[PDB]
Symmetry: C2
Subunit: 137 residues, 2 copies
Amino acid sequence: ADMGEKFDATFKAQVKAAKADMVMLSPKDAYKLLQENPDITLIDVRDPDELKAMGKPDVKNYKHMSRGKLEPLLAKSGLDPEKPVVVFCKTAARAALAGKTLREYGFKTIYNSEGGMDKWLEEGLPSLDRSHHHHHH
Amino acid sequence: ADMGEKFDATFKAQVKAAKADMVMLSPKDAYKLLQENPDITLIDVRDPDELKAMGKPDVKNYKHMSRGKLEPLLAKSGLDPEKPVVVFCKTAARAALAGKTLREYGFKTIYNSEGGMDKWLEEGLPSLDRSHHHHHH
């Protein structure tokens, strides 16, 4: 009555395969091609409160696709299977669902961003954040 | 040119399969089994920041499993494939990944919560939220 350890290994086997499905990059390597090639778009999948409180990537070619998992919003942004795209927030937000799907449909070059939103802010990458110092408590 | 019409339906097919691989129950029926039977645990899989702001389900046996997709926390929660569990927030956070994977391991009864966090608050269900009573302008 304690099979928590038993199935845990399997869960990690399934979930990790989702990041393995596509080309795993790093937010710097991803931004590199983003800023140089305005045709390569980054699609961020994260909730509005963290985006508001902590910040989100500041990129010229940025599409934030929310809904439940960008499903109905995908066509709304304007995407074609010959366009290179990268997804942010792989783990918690599950960018793996956002990106690995597209390549499973027929997208040329799709990248997944290792780490997450925390890596964007921390790696010194261009972020759009409401930097405010008017607060003590 | 544009393949929006094409993949929009496909993405909806894959994302929908995730709700289909679960027993879809409404938060009222979900909380019912939770509050009456403390063996049926509800697992909330969502971000803590929006949780802080909007509120989270205040049930007797609520466990927040926060990782990439609850994988490493599922082992430490004290769960056994003889217990029924329901996953809340099938929307953006996609609790469907939490529950649909578990049935692949042989759980007793796994439910997915129709609607989402919005349905919990809207239904006036037991929630733990910090009333924003510090704003008059």
